[PDB]
Design a protein around this ligand. Structure first.
Ligand SMILES: [Fe+3]
Ligand SMILES: [Zn+2]
Ligand SMILES: [Zn+2]
Ligand SMILES: [Zn+2]
Lengths: 205, 205, 205
């Protein structure tokens, strides 16, 4: 089966199975393993791998999409001594996650978000982009091949294609999304399309 | 099944199934969905995803190869009002495509071509490279980790490893493939090998 | 089947099947094809592709891990005339390989090692990183999105995130891993975790 429980390990005494909204579409060639919550109208495309086997949840909010070849995984959040590793946990609205993906977020083909990480609502994570040990605000755009490592990206900023942002000083000076910016409407178009695709694929299963 | 029709959606009243030449080899762990044409002696490797579900065809010419983990997909080419989005369509020899891959083209492991895009004959798209909203000429080489976004790459040029080309002024000044260039014969060697691999894999099915 | 022989071709008269230690865990959604040796306690994750069909072995040492979406493949090592192509072969401890991955090595999500290549013991190859025509020493760290092409990386060095190293002069001046370096203990933590994951996943099969 492509939707599976995680295994018993020293930090995981009890396997967890994914909680998937009935309106989500999970492609038969995607893999979803472990403590994962997937929200309404989410599309998970072929060859995506969402794997939550190192403790604590990976959450994917409503009307988000996880495109072909995308990987979601996270660093260990509970050591063998049962103790939570606080550095590897993100907090969003009073709850703890290994990876938090907000609502209306697009994770475009071959991108990767690796916990600890949070991605705010209405954000586009571009093709082949990378997010690790970072919090990405709402209404952001990571252009294709950009990366954010170890930083907080403020709401409404974009990272130009190919740029790798590793310092908070850099992240603080990223340009703003404006109406004339080439990717300012990309995420809303992509979300609308993928919500329709998920419904159409559901009608084939 | 790993070869599948695309779904019914507002822009796609009738599902299309892939048209695949009998001499092509499609790995059982690849995915090919929707309005896709695959030519003679093409090799499609494990974990590749070719997905044509947003309108108009993805074409892969004869003796081309689509290696492990490669993604082909395209932006919407027909809006919900049935109207063609001309910005998202490429024209090659009087025909319209969402993605056009020419003959004898190598899409090497983990690369991605995202429509609208065209790739001319005898071109090598290197490992992890990225092509989006671009036309790449014939006899070109994209070295590993290069990218072409929003540009036209003239015939016979190469992009050095890791370079991300986003402006036409940059693309116009790319170096030429010459006989002493390290990748000048790479594509022809790779094409010959993959044509033989496709035949050998066909004999195992 | 996801574990398969390679095909008969002009350079490969006899198919080879993978040799896999009984304590290794190969995910059902990974692909392993051809002349491949996988050592003890190795974890091979969903969507990884290890493909040895162009001659000579791909070796993955004990307690190594091959994470989601990783690709291992190699250039042709035997031409159609039966003659070994020495440029495309690496030698490690008196034996020849197309790709050699040492013991306790982590190939993190979406990375790729393409032969000819060798990766020494206790080395971390970071997320989305790329190694091709290179020898990477022991105790090295390739940070996410780094790449080494055509070079030898000395023992105990790291490549900063996003850096693409293509010249030996560059590789010779890479910084050293020290105890205060952010990734100095990452590989040992990741190896220990993955050895435990492999055992837990084995208990589900
Ligand atoms: Fe797969
Ligand atoms: Zn991970
Ligand atoms: Zn797409
Ligand atoms: Zn290859």
């Amino acid at each position: 089966s492509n939707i599976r429980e995680n295994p018993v390990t020293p930090w995981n005494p009890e396997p967890s199975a994914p909680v998937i909204d009935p309106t989500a579409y999970i492609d038969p060639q995607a893999s979803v393993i472990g403590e994962v919550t997937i929200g309404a109208n989410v599309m998970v495309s072929p060859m995506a791998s969402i794997r939550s086997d190192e403790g604590m949840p990976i959450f994917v909010g409503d009307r988000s999409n996880v495109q072909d070849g995308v990987v979601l995984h996270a660093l260990e959040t509970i050591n063998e001594e049962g103790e939570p590793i606080e550095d590897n946990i993100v907090e969003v609205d009073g709850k703890e996650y290994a990876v938090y993906i907000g609502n209306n977020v697009s994770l475009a083909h071959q991108s990767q978000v690796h916990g600890p990480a949070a991605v705010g609502d209405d954000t586009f994570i571009g093709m082949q982009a990378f997010v690790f040990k970072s919090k990405v605000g709402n209404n952001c755009v990571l252009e294709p091949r950009s990366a954010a490592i170890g930083v907080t990206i403020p709401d409404g900023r974009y990272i130009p294609a190919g740029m790798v942002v590793t310092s908070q000083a850099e992240a603080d000076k990223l340009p703003e999304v404006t109406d004339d910016y080439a990717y300012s409407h990309t995420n809303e178009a992509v979300v609308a399309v993928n919500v329709h695709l998920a419904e159409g694929y559901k009608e084939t299963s």
